[PDB]
Amino acid sequence: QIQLVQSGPELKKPGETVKISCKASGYTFTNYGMNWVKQAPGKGLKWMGWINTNTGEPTYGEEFKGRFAFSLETSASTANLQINNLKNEDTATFFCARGEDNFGSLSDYWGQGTTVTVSSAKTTAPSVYPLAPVCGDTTGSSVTLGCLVKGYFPEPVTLTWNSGSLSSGVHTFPAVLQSDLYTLSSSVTVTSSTWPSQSITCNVAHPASSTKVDKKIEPRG
Amino acid sequence: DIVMTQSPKFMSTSVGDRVTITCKASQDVSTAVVWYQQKPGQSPKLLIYWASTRHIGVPDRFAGSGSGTDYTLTISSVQAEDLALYYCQQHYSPPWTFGGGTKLEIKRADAAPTVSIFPPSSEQLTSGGASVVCFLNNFYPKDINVKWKIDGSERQNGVLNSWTDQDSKDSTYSMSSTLTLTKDEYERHNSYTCEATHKTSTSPIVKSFNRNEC
């Protein structure tokens, strides 16, 4: 159906300006205007305004007038947001939705978001460590393995146990920020029969600084 | 500006029940209320506009209701996949104001936490750092309490707890408690105990260690 995709999640330090894009698959760009919603980890959903993808008429919600600019690259059926003279207050995830009607009261279809992190912190690639067990009856007929990803900035971090193929049993935790960087954990409970028989592994891509680790969880027991 | 007000802010029912969620606003918005659902790590989607018209492909089991200032989304047969935030939104006058969301937890049956303690990795030990990770995995309800006691003493600094949100599939919760130290801190001690207070027992769950072969 309509398939709006949005650009990747940027890290821009206070003062700068970021280009955020929405590229319209699915509909005929011109007869349906673009809506832009902000979602802080706070309030919930906020309307920033609409863009009449026909003439380019923009409408901004009060809190948004002036530092924000909805624009389009018509041709590409693309709509862009631009936050200029970036505040750490703008640290959030933005959406382009598609306005069903004139002005965009209903928003049928939303892009996947673009997360901006306004921050002065350094990109520090992670240290990945294989967390493997000392001993013990882990509940019954099962063994958990773990993995810690300490030291990275900024989030995201993509973890995968054995190339994606190892799925059932994972609990990847949220990242948590201790001051300047993030720390992460993921657990995967395998059957007693699967390990160190088979080869469990903690594959880690830090998109942000090209890092990709695959620590193996050697038995060390 | 119209002001979409939601309360409660968390709501729970079991599998197969009904739940109802209150959205009200400042003035008479003439049924022009939209409902979205935003599942954790997903775009919102349009459930309902004009307080009752189901959008393409939302099932019969999500019903719209309301009038004047006062609106209510009712879900029936609460599936495991219905945990998400529900959001209402005015669409009578600009600017379109949204409620603050409501979490739908699916009330499950009780489940004791499967806990696992983990030694500092020799790799981080050459780095001069020591973290003892404990997982407390698949518990129900959300109420866990996780203390460390290094050598029998409540170590309450250095720890960082992380929590999983409710599982879509089995409605449990998991948690991580990493407790970092330095090598000469680690190497000065020897019992390391992760303890867990949880409704599914009296006697505190305890995962404790020091190295030896297995």
Side-chain angles (χ1 to χ4, degrees):
Chain A
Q1 302 314 65
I2 308 331
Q3 309 301 160
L4 309 176
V5 75
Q6 296 197 41
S7 34
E10 292 149 277
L11 167 66
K12 285 294 179 303
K13 38 261 147 68
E16 296 176 312
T17 291
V18 63
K19 204 72 184 296
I20 293 195
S21 343
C22 196
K23 304 131 171 181
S25 277
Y27 64 101
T28 329
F29 199 51
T30 284
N31 202 27
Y32 286 89
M34 279 277 184
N35 244 12
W36 288 94
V37 180
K38 190 201 175 181
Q39 180 161 255
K43 297 101 203 195
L45 291 156
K46 218 190 166 108
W47 183 67
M48 311 157 69
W50 177 70
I51 189 76
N52 173 280
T53 39
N54 209 293
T55 69
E57 274 295 64
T59 307
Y60 293 75
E62 244 72 279
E63 200 154 330
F64 296 103
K65 262 174 174 283
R67 280 195 318 96
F68 294 114
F70 311 149
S71 357
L72 35 84
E73 285 160 41
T74 3
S75 331
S77 322
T78 295
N80 308 105
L81 189 109
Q82 214 186 128
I83 318 172
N84 295 87
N85 173 55
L86 253 180
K87 272 52 170 298
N88 65 351
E89 281 217 52
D90 300 319
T91 189
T93 297
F94 301 84
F95 302 105
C96 33
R98 164 214 197 228
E100 203 283 311
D101 62 319
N102 183 33
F103 282 74
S105 84
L106 259 76
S107 300
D108 72 344
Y109 311 79
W110 300 66
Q112 88 283 354
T114 296
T115 311
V116 106
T117 292
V118 201
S119 179
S120 359
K122 49 183 175 180
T123 45
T124 335
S127 227
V128 167
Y129 297 117
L131 286 269
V134 64
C135 209
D137 197 287
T138 312
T139 305
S141 323
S142 51
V143 61
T144 304
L145 313 180
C147 185
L148 202 74
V149 177
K150 287 175 80 55
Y152 63 106
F153 193 86
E155 257 230 84
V157 142
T158 311
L159 199 152
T160 356
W161 284 102
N162 284 115
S163 311
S165 325
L166 200 64
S167 316
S168 267
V170 308
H171 280 247
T172 292
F173 289 98
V176 48
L177 182 69
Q178 197 165 64
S179 308
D180 208 86
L181 31 271
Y182 296 98
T183 279
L184 185 60
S185 308
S186 190
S187 332
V188 73
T189 308
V190 254
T191 64
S192 315
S193 331
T194 19
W195 181 75
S197 329
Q198 296 298 291
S199 312
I200 309 309
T201 273
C202 206
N203 306 90
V204 174
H206 189 48
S209 63
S210 318
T211 351
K212 53 254 286 179
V213 187
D214 299 9
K215 291 302 168 171
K216 172 190 197 55
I217 280 73
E218 298 98 287
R220 64 156 239 80
Chain B
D1 293 43
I2 313 254
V3 182
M4 247 73 175
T5 20
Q6 266 176 260
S7 219
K9 183 167 190 57
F10 186 81
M11 211 107 179
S12 42
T13 6
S14 298
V15 173
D17 291 324
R18 289 180 308 253
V19 54
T20 257
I21 347 191
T22 38
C23 168
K24 43 162 297 302
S26 329
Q27 63 213 56
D28 185 350
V29 177
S30 227
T31 330
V33 168
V34 162
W35 289 97
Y36 305 105
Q37 173 220 70
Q38 168 180 242
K39 283 179 189 80
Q42 264 138 119
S43 337
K45 211 274 288 259
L46 212 183
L47 268 25
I48 284 196
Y49 40 94
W50 287 108
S52 348
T53 311
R54 256 186 295 298
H55 183 241
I56 173 98
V58 2
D60 59 278
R61 36 186 283 256
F62 289 86
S65 199
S67 123
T69 44
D70 263 42
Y71 301 98
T72 188
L73 167 80
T74 297
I75 307 188
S76 345
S77 278
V78 197
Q79 277 172 359
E81 235 89 43
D82 296 337
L83 79 134
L85 280 136
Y86 286 87
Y87 289 76
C88 66
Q89 180 220 304
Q90 174 278 98
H91 75 88
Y92 181 69
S93 320
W96 327 113
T97 45
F98 302 66
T102 303
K103 239 287 187 179
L104 178 96
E105 167 191 84
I106 311 173
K107 236 287 168 190
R108 190 211 183 270
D110 270 39
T114 283
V115 190
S116 336
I117 184 174
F118 271 101
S121 158
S122 8
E123 284 151 276
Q124 78 175 106
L125 293 176
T126 60
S127 313
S131 306
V132 187
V133 178
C134 194
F135 289 121
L136 286 80
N137 226 296
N138 289 293
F139 45 87
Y140 193 84
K142 196 211 289 127
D143 282 22
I144 198 72
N145 186 310
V146 183
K147 307 165 204 68
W148 286 85
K149 282 180 180 190
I150 302 184
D151 260 294
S153 320
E154 309 61 67
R155 168 71 152 238
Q156 255 76 113
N157 81 338
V159 69
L160 314 72
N161 305 86
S162 190
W163 272 262
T164 322
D165 201 330
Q166 192 159 53
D167 182 16
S168 322
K169 295 174 58 80
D170 66 34
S171 317
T172 72
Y173 291 89
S174 307
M175 191 244 197
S176 165
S177 177
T178 305
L179 162 125
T180 296
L181 316 157
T182 45
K183 200 167 55 211
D184 42 39
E185 199 159 10
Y186 177 52
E187 286 193 294
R188 174 183 156 231
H189 277 317
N190 46 56
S191 298
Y192 281 116
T193 295
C194 163
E195 183 194 89
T197 311
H198 182 271
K199 171 193 190 178
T200 52
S201 193
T202 48
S203 320
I205 306 286
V206 167
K207 229 63 190 299
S208 300
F209 95 119
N210 204 267
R211 295 183 215 244
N212 241 252
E213 35 46 78
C214 202

